[PDB]
Design a protein around this ligand. Structure first.
Ligand SMILES: [Zn+2]
Ligand SMILES: [Zn+2]
Ligand SMILES: [Zn+2]
Ligand SMILES: [Zn+2]
Ligand SMILES: [Zn+2]
Lengths: 258, 259, 266, 264, 48, 49
RNA sequence: AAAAAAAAAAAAAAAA
RNA sequence: AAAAAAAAAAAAAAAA
RNA sequence: UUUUUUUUUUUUUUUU
RNA sequence: UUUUUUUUUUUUUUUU
């Protein structure tokens, strides 16, 4: 793939592809594709993976707290013995310990603005905002209505309400598909989390070790060329960008790093 | 699928799946899935689902139709936001790819008589308002945002807006790869269409089973049992449903059909 | 099959199909299908590459109709050009290339097919624009037949449709989806989809191989509790996995003794 | 990295992090991170993990019930990665265990279980829940769940002073163990490891299902002692010592080179 | 002869007729007349 | 005829191997889709499959 | 000896 | 290259 | 006894 | 982890 790099660069300069297509059309590895993408002046946390909305509902005289991911359709439900701030804080702590979370959108209820919730948010380093935000609220209410309908559908076949709530949550999470790629809500969340983690790791790796200066020998030319910014340093080869924007790969034996 | 009919039914007893999910997982015909869901007292992403919406840019109206299950998009610059133009765009889209379901918001142009006439002519199940499917509620908005983002990268080296729109659509459809399979939208759409074509060719449809009565011999009981509705007539065996709500596949030698 | 006789007739009221399509859809015999076709007053009775397309222009009722025809299958696309100019033809070519893979365009030597706009558009998509008499007369004959059939269908449909564009779109829909073709008894759209899917088999295999070259697997061999690896993954099964170690050995490991990880690094 | 030392110290003082986590988070060298963790009254630098037991599957979980401060704590541990799910049961009864299993199975894919012969693990509620979720249940004769319980107890003791109630302490300990504690086999926390395993399983299944009816270089093979040739079958891998084949029926078979013929 | 199919069916359900007679009267082809007699619960295709 | 019958019986008995000694061992079985244990029922034949 | 096309014979499944 | 004998490795089923 | 789907055989013609 | 039945591989020896 040594000679494929100029072709990939010209292809991106023409069509503006993404790295997952460059790494599959020219068979070049992942980090080389990321470096090619990030060398483009136009292409170069999304705050959409860790946004959750919490609400409380009444059913049969009991209180059910539902936390819904804004993206996809993942939900988590718990029957609260008492509508108090301590139980809400405990449920938020459990949700945070189960899945990553960064933001939280709750209403102006007395329990959501209590001191315990603020203490939990401060301990967990969570930005919590209460009030009127957009159109995702409609989807949240739609999810709540769907949960209520599923609860009513199979209520008669069980004795306790907690078992019915758990069954409804399982049905809504793992047994209902639809959307892009035909993925249930329990797989879309995992897909977004994995893609975000991969992007963050690659960006950190590329942009951390970037202040180095590497002199390289290209081809049979014995003269030392450069200086060029170090992109990726490996066991056998290193990829770097020259001041002209060209990204190339040079073996360690032909590269000197300062 | 003799051994698949009972087990699939068991699924509907526990999680209460849908008939589409039954076809997707158990590769069963639509008629038997409909019989299964109908038999349950509680109960009373496809290859042909599209979502159409409009947007404004530089004083020009752009209409975008998006396939929810793959991400394929099609764009057209409408001279005016009228019912006739949108109906013509829908007719043009339906003449290239198979359309069996169209969903759109409650805008005035989507409610006009021209759209209804076109949908009736093309035999399309057109719905408006809140999407019945829980998911796919924001795919079109994300696609519109992506198109608006990519059009700016190309607008600089382009004279006319229509050329920029066409280039952006080409780039989005062919030059970008998705996740969980690593397929661009066009390849995924073509694969889904091919699979559906093979399945429908195998099915051959044309059932017209009506309300033919069936008498069946179950187990070792010699006496006739029933009468029961007819669900599927096959050369090797026949699938039937009883008035109680049980779906049973029996060999032809122990089935008598009365019209 | 008499019960299908009425309904099929109703279909011929809307879409003017041929006897082949009715026979293939409603399972009617050939003679009765031909009789149904004849009963309508307004009715009578190549091996190119996958990415081969042709373009043509026609004049009808003071309007310019641009037709792009697939050569191998017969799938067609039509547009109403406002004014016959190189810019409009280039825009139509760009629009067609944004839906289907185009690799070779055959046109005539007209004035609007040689303008700088057409050359720029063909260079942007990296396609070979050939102008002149086609090498195979069969392709030209098929294109002319497609144009004549489009004109006939437009004439048949125009009586029930007010505007010209709607009639052209309906004729295109009928030609692409309703009337069947020759070998295989498939519609032009179905044949095009099948050909494109068949052509796209090697690329998916190469992509799968390249992606599988990324996963790592840690395996346990024998009764030794210490884990081993990392090794390249060859195949993953429901019961056991097949791996290729760095030394070249091929090892089958039960599923309970194998753990597959795709690292975030590299 | 002089400016990162106070931030790392504050973060460790809030939740006690592993030395590997501090090394891989603030990019500090090993020596300074080890000095930071070592200079803590209730922290050690042991860093001696053990093997991943013997049954390591994606859909295999475990269960246990421990007693602490006169309360019953139910713990479920993912064997392959090390994920921990904890709950406080009002009573050590079968119904509570069934409810907890139903709650756990509603979040992550479960296809197996490994419990002991306790009275609550053989109740009719357990059988009904297992039948409803299509979960295979085994009982009888481990080390992983005991180690996780010991670590959870140690973390609870570490964080018990600050909090007032016990449920909050258990939740905080679970949060610390799941996320803010780096581990081996790729240097990732258990939650990230579990997500990675699930995603790679899904991707492998999808990619394998993408190609099922076409390949290159169909080959003929001889199976067992039967000298009759068989095939043709799709070629998956061609090697110097042996070849890996996939037949039309979906079976994968390894065949020595002397028993395979390649055609083009 | 498509318009004569309902009349032939009505005549057949009034009194049952042989397929040869139906073919001779309404000038239907053999296959369609055989189909008409075919769709009768109390008729056969012996023709002996 | 006697030799043929003896040979067939010898093959059948070699396949059987006898030596059952099943005694009154009790069995709990899961029949159909019912998850609850049913029985108890006497053991008749213990086979690998 | 292998491939393709046309005609003829028999058998199995299905409707009458 | 085929048959026979001895030793070694892995997997499936069964009892603990 | 008639008609559709599948399978197994015979004859003729065109190439290798 | 130990023991029986079956299957798949490696090494050595004796013949063809
Ligand atoms: Zn770019
Ligand atoms: Zn139901
Ligand atoms: Zn007609
Ligand atoms: Zn500490
Ligand atoms: Zn009659």
């Amino acid at each position: 793939f040594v000679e494929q790099i100029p072709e990939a660069q010209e292809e991106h300069e023409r069509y503006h592809n993404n790295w997952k297509d460059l790494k599959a059309r020219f068979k070049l590895p992942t980090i080389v594709a990321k470096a090619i993408i990030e060398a483009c002046p136009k292409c170069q946390t999304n705050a959409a993976v860790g946004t959750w909305q919490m609400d409380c509902t009444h059913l049969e005289g009991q209180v059910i707290c539902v936390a819904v991911h804004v993206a996809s359709g993942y939900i988590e439900t718990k029957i609260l013995p008492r509508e108090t701030g301590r139980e809400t804080a405990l449920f938020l702590l459990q949700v945070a310990s189960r899945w990553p979370i960064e933001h939280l959108h709750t209403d102006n209820g007395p329990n959501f603005v209590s001191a315990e919730m603020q203490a939990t948010a401060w301990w967990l380093k969570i930005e919590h905002t209460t009030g009127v935000p957009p159109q995702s609220q409609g989807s949240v209410e739609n999810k709540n209505k769907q949960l209520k309908k599923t609860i009513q559908q199979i209520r008669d076949e069980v004795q306790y309400l907690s078992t019915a709530v758990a069954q409804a949550t399982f049905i809504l999470n793992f047994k209902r598909r639809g959307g892009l790629g035909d993925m249930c809500p329990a797989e879309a969340l995992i897909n977004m989390i994995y893609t975000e983690l991969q992007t963050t790791t690659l960006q950190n790796q590329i942009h951390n070790f970037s202040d180095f200066k590497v002199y390289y020998r290209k081809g049979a030319n014995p003269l030392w060329q450069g200086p060029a910014h170090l992109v990726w340093k490996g066991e056998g080869a290193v990829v770097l960008r020259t001041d002209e924007g060209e990204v190339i790969t040079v073996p360690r034996r032909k590269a000197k790093i300062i």
